[PDB]
Enzyme design. Sequence first.
Site, PDB file in Angstrom:
ATOM      1  CB  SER A  49      -0.937   0.470   0.885  1.00  0.00           C
ATOM      2  OG  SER A  49      -0.044   0.172   2.824  1.00  0.00           O
ATOM      3  CG  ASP A 154       3.573  -6.848  10.397  1.00  0.00           C
ATOM      4  OD1 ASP A 154       4.737  -7.164  10.616  1.00  0.00           O
ATOM      5  OD2 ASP A 154       3.221  -6.393   9.577  1.00  0.00           O
TER       6      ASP A 154
END
EC number: 2.7.11.1
Length: 327
Positions: A49, A154
Amino acid sequence: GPVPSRARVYTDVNTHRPSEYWDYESHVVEWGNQDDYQLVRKLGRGKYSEVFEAINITNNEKVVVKILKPVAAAKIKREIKILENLRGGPNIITLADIVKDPVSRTPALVFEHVNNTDFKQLYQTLTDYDIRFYMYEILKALDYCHSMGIMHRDVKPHNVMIDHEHRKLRLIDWGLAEFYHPGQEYNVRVASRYFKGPELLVDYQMYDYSLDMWSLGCMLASMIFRKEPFFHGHDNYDQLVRIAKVLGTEDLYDYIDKYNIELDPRFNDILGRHSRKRWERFVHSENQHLVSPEALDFLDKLLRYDHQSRLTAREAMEHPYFYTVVK
Ligand SMILES: Nc1ncnc2c1ncn2[C@@H]1O[C@H](COP(=O)(O)OP(=O)(O)OP(=O)(O)O)[C@@H](O)[C@H]1O
Ligand SMILES: Clc1cc2[nH]ccc2cc1Br
């Protein structure tokens, strides 16, 4: 082959929820008005992104827009479903809108803006009390998402936004997050190198929420010992050797034997034989003010090879290390 494994907590949260809750492929995305947002400046770009600071012109509020790069609709709907499921949860970033970007022709996720303090300044300025305070705040977000049947996968400092002025914390970047289903084999290519659990490094796919607790332990060790990162591997293989130099090889072999895992033979000529080190080995005059017997005991209970032995987020919140934190 490998011995199966299941989480010791929140094992059947998804089995007892409506299929709509975890069946992200079936989710119908509700689209907002892209003209409500004016992009102000590009903040970053990754493989998945481009991130922008923007203004919501309907209320003049600052927002962050993540414009997704060309990727599978499976990953897109998964992130949206997870963000919508966790919205309003303690310390979980708020997804404000979902719009179609006119240029990329891909989805753009709109998030609340957090006035994030510089990470380098945070890492260098956090006091013993601040480390305990913020670690308790991240545990609230992790227990919430785990209790909701989701693993973040994450956890790392860049994914923890802190506005040091308002003592506000948000857990962000849910693009790798996944729903926990007992018995499910997951992809081990998740988390960032220095925060990857031993289960990912030895290719054990039946992992669970406890992966996030290893990553949190790595953050804790780097903060209290003033060593970033704590486990500094050159690649995914050296990453396991760096861990083994601290926790030792005997407990590593007991872990792989328990789960009937066979290590990649490439570890035969790099792992060596290492004893477990006492945590006091990493204490020195420059980090002593951040270390206490409660910090080391807590760390010791997160940084365990056996994912089933690590503290859960809720057990971690019970630890003496947090007794000093005002609740
Ligand atoms: N909700 C938010 N509010 C304010 N800033 C944000 C928000 N979400 C992301 N950002 C900021 O956007 C910037 C770019 O994000 P991006 O995830 O691409 O890079 P990064 O933090 O360096 O991550 P990584 O280390 O994973 O590459 C970062 O500085 C990040 O802190
Ligand atoms: Cl919980 C926590 C998260 C963080 N993100 C960046 C610095 C930092 C410090 C702590 Br302690």
